[PDB]
Ligand binder design. Sequence first.
Ligand SMILES: [Mg+2]
Ligand SMILES: [Zn+2]
Ligand SMILES: [Zn+2]
Length: 227
Amino acid sequence: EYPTVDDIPVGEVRLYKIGDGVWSHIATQKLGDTVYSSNGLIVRDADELLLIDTAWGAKNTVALLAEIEKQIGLPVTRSISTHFHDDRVGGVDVLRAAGVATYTSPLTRQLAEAAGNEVPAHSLKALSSSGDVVRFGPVEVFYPGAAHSGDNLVVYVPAVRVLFGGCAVHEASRESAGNVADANLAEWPATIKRIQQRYPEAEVVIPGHGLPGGLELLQHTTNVVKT
Ligand SMILES: [Mg+2]
Ligand SMILES: [Zn+2]
Ligand SMILES: [Zn+2]
């Protein structure tokens, strides 16, 4: 049932229900002669939605908003981007045009500017140091330290124990680290250990790319990373 590249054309978006008031969104994108899929999250708060990450570019992000309106029918009023790459901030300008208040950490804003990428309009204070956690509506936003990138964040939904690990967590089937050009391989194991110690009751862990699993994806990541 979980959507894969085999069942999503570039430009279409699927939603997948994870728990009470929580969905993932799945989109596809072509870089080389390589098609990839990518995951974000949607979380209900009263009569509005918090979005976690864009759908990897402007075209997919317009389609994401249309699919949310078809299937859920509540407005997206705020978003958080979990690092500075195009699968997280690509389409922020679509979000802004639609009246969404877009956020991320100050470091993500700085790195996205340096990369030429779109930049969320607002900073999350108090996320500058490894181990820092803030509340944001129905979630917790945690900065566990450098890993896939220097600025990567994870997002936990306490009411239903769902952790979105983003691109700092690899899916079960992946055995290589992927794109490491912004990675800190030396800190990556310590970063995974902070996530494990902070969220020991998580029932679902969603990676930035691929199939959701449970807490076993965290040790799996450490294993892929060392090698
Ligand atoms: Mg770019
Ligand atoms: Zn990335
Ligand atoms: Zn990614």
